[PDB]
Amino acid sequence: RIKTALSKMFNAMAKVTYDIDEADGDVIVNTAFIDKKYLDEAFDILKEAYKKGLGISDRFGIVEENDRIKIQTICAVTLDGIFLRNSVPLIPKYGGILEITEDKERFIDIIGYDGSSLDPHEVFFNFVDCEKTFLAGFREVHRVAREKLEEVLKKLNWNGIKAIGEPNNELYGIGVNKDMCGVVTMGGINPLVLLKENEIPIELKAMHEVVRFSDLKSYK
Amino acid sequence: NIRIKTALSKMFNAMAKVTYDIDEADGDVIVNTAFIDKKYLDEAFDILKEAYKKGLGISDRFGIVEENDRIKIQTICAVTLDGIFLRNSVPLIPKYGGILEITEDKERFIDIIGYDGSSLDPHEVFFNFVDCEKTFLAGFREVHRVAREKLEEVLKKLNWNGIKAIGEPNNELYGIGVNKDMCGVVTMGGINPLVLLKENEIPIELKAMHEVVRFSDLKSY
Known about the structure:
The structure is a homodimer. By secondary structure, chain A is of the alpha+beta class. Chain A contains 6 helices and 10 strands, in the order H-E-H-E-E-H-E-E-H-E-H-E-E-H-E-E. In chain A, helix 1 (5-13) crosses helix 3. Chain A is globular, with a radius of gyration of 17 Å. Chain B: Residues 3-221 are annotated as: NRD 2.
């Protein structure tokens, strides 16, 4: 029996424990691995990546392992989880490639979570350069809940949401459902793209962990 | 205007072009188009014959045209099947494209992408991850319970390789769940024989273009 990405993400939401009032709790992170000889350069590129608005929140993880280096970046499913905790249902719809050139802002390729058994961002990882093209998710919120969403987001004070569209409106080329508002999140593994782009060879298995937000390091 | 078009809507539009009649055993079909250098014409025809003998690919027929400096290869898409079924009043809804594993004790899709939410051809992602011995490109369609008996009537009058399995109403088929009062239909990927070329050390330029071609202008195996 095949599990859809949507249902993997739903199960993942229930482990989210992040409280905005405390500014701490359990988050969902991507876990990537690199060789130990790239430790110094990776931290630098990661700091720069977070300064350039890549990834979700100001925090990421970088730990010493026996032979390799473990790097943790927060998944957008964490946002899905925080919002649910605050009575704001967000439905993840698509993952794909976001194009930002001087002229426009559009999704150029997408995969839907509902009917796929892959992480869309693992499929598009190598066709992204994090200068013109970025990994991104498309979420939907109900229009009445949209006000609460912006209030919760402001209190959250995290990098990660790129846009919130008007009810029933096309957003970055993607149409929305009846009485829904498009929410575009930045891809969590975007900072990892920049390591590849600076010749840091990334081995990414589809590994996700629940970690405490406090144990992650800020870019400041 | 920069609206994303889904794989599903590309397929509905393609169905309209299908003109194949079961009773006349001819009509317009939808093909993929692939390119190889003319050095490999001899070897490729033998592999293609073998692929179609092994029941891979859709139908018994394929295109093999002398181009200028290359050789154009044409294989029939599953969307032809969809088109053929709609013309016999059997609405077939394409759901997923993916990798079908046929192993020792398991018959399962191991990875899929949904047509209705994606702007990619799923077989374009999964082309490099199949060997055509244990793993195969495959499609998943849903047919309504009432149309099922009609579908099987049409299938046998068509007499084409392509349909791997038809499931029971409201039952999982090959690891994939099904909607309310529906039956799973597993089609084989039209570009499976193209995999065998690549696997037998033949370089192949796979193109995104699909052609509407007469069934008569293709060669039987």
